[PDB]
Design a protein around this ligand. Structure first.
Ligand code: MYR
Ligand code: MYR
Ligand code: MYR
Ligand code: MYR
Lengths: 278, 52, 242, 240, 242, 278, 240, 52, 49
């Protein structure tokens, strides 16, 4: 049926890399492809065929593993809240900045528009952190800014009449759910050269764009936990638009909410004793 | 696609209502490298001298 | 109910799964997409942009100066300016460039690379330089006589400030390994050598600076690609960021 | 026939250079006004025209032997200047592009190279989160302390991904960049957010054919382009 | 049986699921739908209805009197009648209105708002009033000279008892955050100021009441919407109801 | 096939918000859109374009998150009966009034016609309420008015020949089932200005409309429980018709079966010291 | 041309006002008879016509300085009045709409504002569940004790969602509301259930151009509209 | 719907017999705000004076 | 295998379920239906007596 045709999108990865045309020797004063001028800011236009004698090469290699979708389109850890047994409650602030691998991958772009698939793995363990048996339901509640936060395991906030929740078992399959692009802005921002507030220039609000922050995930067990639970929160970025590539992060990350780095030794690649030998 | 060479051909079937539920997009989209490599008002053809 | 047989792989979570999954906010209607300049659809658009090699990686050089290879007035003929093992992996000068940092995320590479050099001496400073690419099998070329036997360009300093040496994809196989993993003998994928030589000499008017610089720049050609995502070696953490 | 000679006429103001390289147009995107499909603010914008879309010259900088570089936030650097500055003060939100012209002449007896970066959303840090005098330095601009790291934990070498030109003294004495508006929203406040940073970083140091080092200034000239303003109220000068 | 692979999210219960589920009474046939007046299909039909602002929120005012802003005969020129931070969230006067109580259930908002004011003085009581909307960036306007620089209407008391100040959607972004969550810096979404001033004065015949009232009313325009349901802050319980 | 076409309904959320037309200045005595009269009971008709000079804005925002279906169309807690080990039996009286979030959401309307999806999560715990292991079937029996109630865990009422029952496992996936609109009336009533009975005006039967009450859910374990079981009963309202919007509840709820409130301090929004400053 | 002058003629009765605002027609729905598709009761209804569809005037109320408000249940308030009252007493079930007219004149030397609510299904409470003398107060009506909470734990400010008019003494001396039948069933008992509540609440207090406060009454006039009755038996007056 | 903008387009597929089993309805239904905002016998056009 | 997501209500037994279920005697062929007087299709035929 055509109605089911609406739920199917045929999508194709068949873009190839550029090929090579055979070329011959050139002795002239007409064509000088090797002479360049980096001052313009343009990258060199010279190609293989104009610099040496080439054979013909039919293109066969795909480019799809470096499409922005493929590069971001896998799951990565973004949150690891620990539910202790004293209160049986925990939360994770929602952003991709606690764990460095996804953050550094995002640092190649300025603005990014995407959806998210979240995946939550819960693991129970003892005080000495050895795996242990515990079968219990847990509740993950999305708490958006301005909604009252639960303060206990039995708080009546966990009613969840308006906050969305997911209920799953600690020893069941992983909870998984998708999320549309939720920013009030038309993209997310990986970096922000401004202040979070008018009438304020506190350093702690520099580089803080609050339209990236959609709130909190809160976690309880539905009864009081017998053992601590660790939730691992994975995000896969999908349906991805990217704008304005950047110099990628090179210094290690130090803080969650700013770009501070050490910068004690100004170098990235390793040293050698002489430029004319390895 | 039971295989052409480097052509992955996929029928993304979304079972849920919201488009955000769909799996990741496998299309190759247009590449315009020259907005980054040749970002200059006057085109400089390869065989010409760049300055002047 | 429809009879079924769940098989192996049931209830597993694979990080590269391509599956639809229920939306926790199925009635949400996002903000429109607006026009923004510089949309990127494929990271090989970035890899084709030139970036500066951290080429002056000599022990003791710090900061911006690591980006300028010294070039001097020579008192002897046919001297060497620079030497560089052609490698997208490892930790040498190519590893910190745009192409090198993308290669840190990938396991395999193919295609031609180009190196653009810009001379920074005074207007009155002259010179001719030989830029050589030696395919693998042996060592770095020891003298300009040996290096010239390879692919090479000869650069005349002048009004057009810059030159390109295209390092063409010359290779037994369709792809090479990015890394130089020793236990796995990925030195099998040795990709050759780049060396720079004085073709004549750097010559100056009396009392000019007797030392100038080359800024080396590198980028991928349009026939280039990467395979197999992999974790970046030098982007680590010992603790959760707070 | 000659991309070494340029003339830029905006408003009542005209720049010339006899040693340009070319003109960089960032992301191949000439500045353009906001279309009805992307716009959200319902009030009718003020478009000041030539009263603001004109070249403004900042104070010059001496290129010294030890110079690490200089930077300016936009619109920040022009927020107190002319009718651009006044339109930016009197409105809640602003949008527009830039025409940037960096001047530095020296002799055929000099050597040295400047890198001229226009960096969008250039959030900066060092070993510490920066204060207001560095995030929004005004017309006088700021100076780099970590030019190798581009003040942001990235690298100067990879900043050629950003729109740029060089000033290599053997070749040219000026760099020109045309910048489109870049943001994740249609308009944004001029006092709270800097959409672009103009960064001028010495890469090859400045050397003279003698040991006596005369004064070689760097001079920045910036024209706003295709500007709109919405949200008229009293004039507010800074985010403090 | 058909081979299957149950994946992640198996057996979870999401409160926003959109799935069919077996009916425990599959033969039941409900009563017909009859006509009832006032069917509502969308809660923005309610948000476009005017409601009264709890505008006189001064400490010590209780009950119905919180709905009437005092307006008096002034002995000085250009005095201020009222000041109000434009906010759908928080706990100020807009928060208890129909629009404000709907905004308590949502995280984000967009669109124009209108404020309708009704004067309640005697037939013989005259006056002119300035109603101002100041876009964000600074503080509340300090004097009528500063407030007039913004969007504003000037109200003449007369036969038509009421006036509208339309607060238009003036905004850097397509949407704002409803809440003023401090830890999350949602003051980023500051939406400006509404102030009321004497444009001339309230003037009365001898021995009339020297004080009258404005009843402020608010509603959404047809270009308004809400996103992201969220829990209402002030609808709580400490125990199950019995 | 067309028969399967009967089981598919293509349904679309594409209603947009109103746009904006550009306008210019008006100097006249003809058109006075800003002059209003709130006495009529009509809301102001004045629009943006007639009050200031506007630009043109193409509408892009949807309205679907405030459709009555979307606003009610999620699950919320409505019942939390506890099955003790002494009798292994419990029940929940069926109405949406024990937990305040759903009740307050319903208080925006007078009459509501809907279906229900019920979801039941069972959790076992110790006497000190710590999660514990217990695998057992439980039975939820719908007991409509006039059907005899079970008095024990082994009562022969649990035969369930005519009452519908659901059997599920305490440590299995949650039981879930749908329900059509069951009222004898043509809608449910959120509020009732009348008496439950003729010939009676007892205050305890004021505001009681017994056509909202469809009876009881009764709960046992199929054997005698070793640990207490807590059932959490969630309801999602769907296929929703709503009539006659109301002033929503503002005072906290106090009782399950009437609208009694404290009303000690007559105010809702917070106070300030002066009307001309914040 | 003038919505300040109105005339309402039902039966043998006619109202006029020279200061109306307009006429509120609740939910845009004029009262209408029950169609065969929604009806359930099989007996042929009695439709009394003009004998009951006519204006009835209740006793007037003084507007005092301290007045919190007044309220009447419908049909409750008219259940002992005229042939409406008799038809409602003699039948088990009843249906119909209302034409409500609130009168209050004062001078151009007075100020004050009444809110005139028609509230459907107005179930009331306070700190306690109310007794019969408040839930069904009869022709004399009841008084508010929590006018801020609208006797029901909601708020007076949000009750403009209900059909309403104002009586603002500078503008008008009368409010008119036309009410359709509202219920979740087709017909319902007149003695057991009140479909509408007429509520008149002072918002701006009553002030005079002197300190001597003459008598300013409020007067309610209500006409049933499009009435039907089914289930004829003996006459039953109240649910007690 | 693999995406138009703010158009969610869903094929609700009910697997059970009773209509009550079906998932929630995603249609946008007609809005008549004026039964609540303009509930008056005589229409008052925006440009007119309301009274008289 | 076809990717699936079993949801809530998995493995429950509802007494009013309307589902097909495997026949323990799939080859059985019942005796024909004969005519019998007084066939009842709906219990409201009894209620009208
Ligand atoms: C739990 C359902 C709603 C949660 C919304 C999650 C959306 C996350 C997007 C994060 C984008 C900003 C990333 C960052 O600031 O580093
Ligand atoms: C339950 C309905 C069954 C429909 C699924 C049919 C199989 C999925 C289509 C996969 C299309 C791409 C596969 C390929 O050719 O590589
Ligand atoms: C267990 C199967 C039959 C149970 C029927 C449940 C229907 C519940 C509808 C409740 C509507 C009235 C809500 C209320 O009174 O507050
Ligand atoms: C087992 C029979 C398979 C039929 C299900 C096909 C997929 C469900 C249709 C979903 C339609 C709306 C999806 C969308 O376009 O957003």
């Amino acid at each position: 049926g055509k109605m089911l045709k609406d739920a199917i999108d045929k999508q194709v990865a068949g873009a190839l890399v550029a090929g090579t045309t055979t070329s011959t020797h050139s002795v002239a004063t007409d064509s000088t492809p090797a002479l360049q001028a980096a001052e313009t800011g343009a990258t060199s236009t010279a190609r293989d065929e104009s610099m040496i004698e080439t054979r013909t090469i039919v293109p066969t290699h795909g480019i799809h593993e470096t499409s922005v979708e493929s590069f971001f389109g896998r799951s990565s850890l973004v949150g690891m809240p620990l539910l202790a047994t004293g209160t049986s409650i925990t939360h994770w602030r929602i952003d991709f900045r606690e764990f460095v691998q996804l953050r550094a991958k995002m640092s190649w772009f300025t603005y990014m528009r995407f959806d998210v698939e979240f995946t939550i793995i819960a693991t129970s363990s003892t005080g000495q952190n050895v795996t242990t048996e515990q079968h219990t339901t847990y509740q993950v509640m999305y708490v958006p800014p301005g909604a009252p936060v639960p303060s206990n395991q039995d708080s009546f906030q966990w009613q969840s009449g308006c906050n969305p929740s997911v209920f799953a078992d600690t020893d069941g399959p992983p909870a998984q759910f998708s999320v549309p692009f939720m920013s009030s802005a038309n993209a997310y921002s990986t970096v922000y050269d401004g202040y979070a507030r008018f009438m304020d220039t506190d350093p702690d609000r520099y580089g803080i764009l609050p339209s990236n922050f959609l709130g909190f995930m809160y976690f309880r067990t539905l009864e009081d936990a017998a053992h601590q639970v660790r939730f691992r929160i994975y995000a896969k970025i999908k349906h991805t638009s990217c704008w304005i590539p950047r110099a990628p992060r090179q210094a290690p990350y130090k803080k969650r909410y700013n770009l501070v780095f050490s910068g004690d030794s100004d170098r990235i690649c390793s040293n050698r004793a002489s430029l004319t030998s390895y | 696609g039971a295989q052409g060479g480097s052509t992955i051909n996929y029928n993304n079937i979304n079972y849920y209502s919201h488009a955000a539920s769909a799996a990741q997009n496998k299309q190759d989209f247009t590449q315009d490298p020259s907005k980054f490599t040749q970002p200059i008002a006057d085109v400089i053809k390869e065989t010409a001298v760049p300055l002047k | 109910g429809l009879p079924t047989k769940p098989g192996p792989g049931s209830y597993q979570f694979m990080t590269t799964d391509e599956d639809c999954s229920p939306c926790i906010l199925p009635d949400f209607q996002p903000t429109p997409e607006i026009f923004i300049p510089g949309k990127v659809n494929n990271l090989l658009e970035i890899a084709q942009v030139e970036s500066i090699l951290e080429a002056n990686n000599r022990e003791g050089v710090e900061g911006v100066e690591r980006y300028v290879i010294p070039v001097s007035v020579q008192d002897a003929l046919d001297a060497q300016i620079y030497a560089l093992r052609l490698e997208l992996g490892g930790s040498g000068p190519l590893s910190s460039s745009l192409l090198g940092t993308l290669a840190k995320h990938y396991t395999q590479w193919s295609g031609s690379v180009e190196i653009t050099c810009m001379f920074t001496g005074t207007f009155m400073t002259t010179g001719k330089v030989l830029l050589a690419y030696t395919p693998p099998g042996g060592d770095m070329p020891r003298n300009r006589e040996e290096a010239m036997l390879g692919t090479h360009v000869i650069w005349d300093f002048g009004l057009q400030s810059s030159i390109t040496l295209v390092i063409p994809w010359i290779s037994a196989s369709h792809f090479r390994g990015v890394s130089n993993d020793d236990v796995l003998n990925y030195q099998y994928y040795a990709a050759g050598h780049v060396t720079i030589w004085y073709q004549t000499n750097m010559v100056i008017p009396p009392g000019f600076p007797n030392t100038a610089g080359i800024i080396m720049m590198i980028a991928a050609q349009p026939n280039f690609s990467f395979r197999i995502q992999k974790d970046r070696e030098d982007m680590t953490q010992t603790a959760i960021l707070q | 026939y000659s991309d070494r000679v340029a003339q830029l006429t905006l408003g009542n103001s005209t720049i010339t250079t006899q040693e340009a390289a070319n003109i960089c147009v960032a992301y191949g995107c000439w500045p353009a006004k906001l279309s009805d499909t992307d716009a959200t603010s319902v009030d009718k914008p003020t478009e000041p025209g030539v009263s603001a879309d004109r070249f403004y010259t900042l104070r010059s900088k001496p290129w010294q032997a030890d110079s690490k570089g200089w930077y300016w936030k936009l619109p920040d650097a022009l927020n107190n200047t002319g009718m651009f500055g006044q339109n930016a003060q009197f409105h809640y939100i602003y949008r527009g592009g830039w025409a940037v012209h960096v001047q530095c002449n020296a002799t055929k007896f000099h050597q040295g190279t400047l890198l001229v970066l226009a960096i969008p959303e250039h959030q900066i840090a060092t070993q510490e989160q920066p204060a207001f005098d560095r995030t929004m330095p005004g017309s006088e601009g700021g100076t780099f302390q970590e030019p190798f790291w581009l003040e942001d934990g990235t690298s100067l070498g990879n900043s050629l991904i950003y729109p740029h030109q060089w000033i290599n003294l053997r070749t040219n004495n000026s760099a020109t960049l045309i910048l489109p508006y870049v943001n994740a929203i249609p308009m944004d406040s001029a006092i709270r957010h800097s959409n672009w940073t103009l960064a001028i970083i010495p890469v090859a140091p400045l050397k003279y054919a003698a040991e006596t080092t005369p004064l070689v200034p760097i001079t920045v000239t910036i024209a706003p382009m295709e500007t709109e303003y919405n949200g008229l109220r009293r004039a507010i000068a800074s985010n403090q």
